[PDB]
Amino acid sequence: ADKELKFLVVDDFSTMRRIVRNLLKELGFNNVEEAEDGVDALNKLQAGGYGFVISDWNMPNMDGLELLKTIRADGAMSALPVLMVTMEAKKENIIAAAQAGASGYVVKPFTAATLEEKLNKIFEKLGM
Ligand code: BEF
Ligand SMILES: [Mn+2]
Ligand SMILES: [Mn+2]
Ligand SMILES: [Mn+2]
Incomplete structure (x- = not known):
């Protein structure tokens, strides 16, 4: 995938955002922003530029399943x-996330290898 691809990383806990941001850096993606909930996310997304979202589920204001549904709609x-x-x-x-259009789904806790594998699976499915 294009190493300039812009990622939005969403989770209500900084620890998890920090892990994902660092993994992406390792994989060669430095264009990475963070959001703290579904609303924060949609704001950054509607600010344009984004090519990929990675998102938590349980978050205040708007959860990840609602965020996913909004994005797909x-x-x-x-x-x-x-x-x-x-x-x-x-x-x-x-099932609920898959049916709502999730591109992939990783269960916490996850390894660096797992995140890399599931990202690449999505890249390949979408021809990125
Ligand atoms: F809060 Be998440 F769903 F891990
Ligand atoms: Mn925090
Ligand atoms: Mn745009
Ligand atoms: Mn959470």
Whole structure:
């Protein structure tokens, strides 16, 4: 994928955003912004430029499933890749996110290898 691809990393806890931002750096992506909830995210997204979203589920203001649904329902960003990264591991959550259009889904805690594999899976599926 283009190493200038702009990522938005969303989670209500800085620890997790920090892990993901650093992993992306390792993979060669330095164009990375953070958001703290679904609303914060949509604000940055509607500020334009973004090529990929990585998002938590449980967050105040707007959760990640609502964020995913909003993104997929907006004609201007409906195809934006959205990778869920969340502690929700139940099959009903995976189903609900998948059905809502998640590009991929990683369960916390995750390894560096896992994030890399699932990002690449999405890149390949989308021809990025
Ligand atoms: F808060 Be997340 F869903 F891990
Ligand atoms: Mn914090
Ligand atoms: Mn744009
Ligand atoms: Mn959370």
